Amino acid sequence: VRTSPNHKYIFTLRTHPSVVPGSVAFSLPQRKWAGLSIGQEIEVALYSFDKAKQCIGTM
Amino acid sequence: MAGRSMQAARCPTDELSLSNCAVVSEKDYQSGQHVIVRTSPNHKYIFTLRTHPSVVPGSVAFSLPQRKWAGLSIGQEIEVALYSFDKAKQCIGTM
Amino acid sequence: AEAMALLAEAERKVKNSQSFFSGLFGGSSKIEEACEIYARAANMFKMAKNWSAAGNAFCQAAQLHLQLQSKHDAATCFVDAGNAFKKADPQEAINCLMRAIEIYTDMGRFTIAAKHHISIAEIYETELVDVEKAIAHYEQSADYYKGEESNSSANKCLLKVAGYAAQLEQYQKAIDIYEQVGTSAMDSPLLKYSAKDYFFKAALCHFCIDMLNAKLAVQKYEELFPAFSDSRECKLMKKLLEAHEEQNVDSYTESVKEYDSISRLDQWLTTMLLRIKKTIQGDEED
């Protein structure tokens, strides 16, 4: 998720019928971590991780 | 400047509710400016503006405490106008 | 008695005359006799509990009666054709009454157009559910009833608009309707006691509003709050406003814990209860 020149956050996708094609739906936490409100047009892009380095083992 | 028709809405998020500033959009007014809300020929109120890229052009968002003073409703037409103070007797010293 | 022979002897008797059958005058005596007999025939089918076959018997009688020249009682035969499938199970009374109402207004008339436009609206609300069209039927029909000072249906069909419209989709119409009824309700010495629940309906509709807009109606309205029946309108509200505004539920719900005994709650009130607490969920539920 790209919103402003200094906020690049990564989320996990999950399709759902109610959502409108060309609109992404978020939850309260997400929208309270990314600092987003409804009615603002964001720049969404797919992102792919590196399996060996990124996979989590102790968090 | 002289006054425009605006529509009352709700403050976007709890972040701009602890500022006591009228949240607006960047397409209408600009952060730093002051305004005088008008609701009748006798109820004139003065607030401070703060832009936010979520407000709808042609609408001003207020928090409950601000709305709990001015008797403002979420979805009514109000006349808002920029209001410039005078730096002589309007600068607070003992409040 | 004859479910078929009146027909068979009238179908060979309905024909236009450009032939040796023409002679001097028209066959309007023949189709007059035939349509009177079709009326009797649709009666004997409805008497024989055949409201589909009877209703279609009204449909030929109702359509063929216009052919001599009779728009007067062909409207009545349209209403009878509508009443048959209104009593019977399916639709197509909707077409009997849409053929009816246009012709009735084409006479130069207003009232019964609305009085069956409400019938279509009742079908398209209760039965052939098309509430987004039935509520328009109530709306235009109440426009006719308004323009005739038949204030009864003028208030009524508006109440039918707003009571479902508010919950489902239209918000400013809710208070605008219940205030349009409420002012002239306060006017008449007959009406100003019905205004109590009318401004209750204006108040308790919250439109994603957290506020005391109901209290704006309080310090508006002629309550005369030593009339305590409006305390079941607004002291109810004077609790639940600050219950919803202080995002609290054990006072909001307590209001109906005590109010269910002192007032029986119908479906619309409890759906609005659930509506304002969906606003409470949107205030609380993360």
CA distance B28 to C283: 29
Q: What is the CA radius of gyration of chain C?
A: 27
Interface test with chain C among B10, B72, B74, by most C beta carbons within 10 Å: B74
Amino acid at site C72: H
Nearest Cα of chain B lies from the Cα of A31 at a distance, in angstroms, of 10
List the single residue in B with minimal CA-CA distance to A32.
B13
B6 touches B79 (CB < 8 A): yes
The pair of three-digit structure tokens given for residue A51, joined into one six-digit string: 């399996």
Sequence-ordered strand ranges (E) for chain B: 4-10, 22-24, 34-38, 44-51, 60-62, 77-82
Tell me the three-class secondary structure of C228-253, residue by residue: HHHCCCCHHHHHHHHHHHCCCCCCHH
B53 near A CB under 8 A: yes
CA distance C17 to C193: 66
Amino acid at site A54: Q
Give kind and range of the element (H or E) at residue A2: strand A2-4
According to DSSP, the β-strands at A7-8 and A2-4 are antiparallel
For chain A, the 3-state helix, strand and coil shares in percent, each to the nearest 5, are 15, 10, 75
C276 touches C206 (CB < 8 A): yes
Q: What's this structure's resolution in Å?
A: 4.4
C97 touches C119 (CB < 8 A): yes
A37 near B CB under 8 A: yes
The technique is cryo-EM
Nearest in space to B27 (alpha carbons), one of B69, B55, B5, B49: B55
Residues of B in contact with A35 (CB under 8 A): 13, 15
According to DSSP, the β-strands at B77-82 and B4-10 are antiparallel
Residues of A in contact with B56 (CB under 8 A): 39
Per-residue exposure over C33-68, b if at least 16 CB sit within 10 Å of its own CB, e if not? ebbebbbebbeebbeeebbebbbbbbbbbbbbbbeb
Interface list for chain C against chain B, based on CB atoms closer than 8 Å? 171-172, 207-211, 213, 216, 245
Query: Phi and psi at residue C79, in whole multiples of 5°?
Result: -65, -35
C104 touches C112 (CB < 8 A): yes
Secondary structure (3-state) at B76: coil
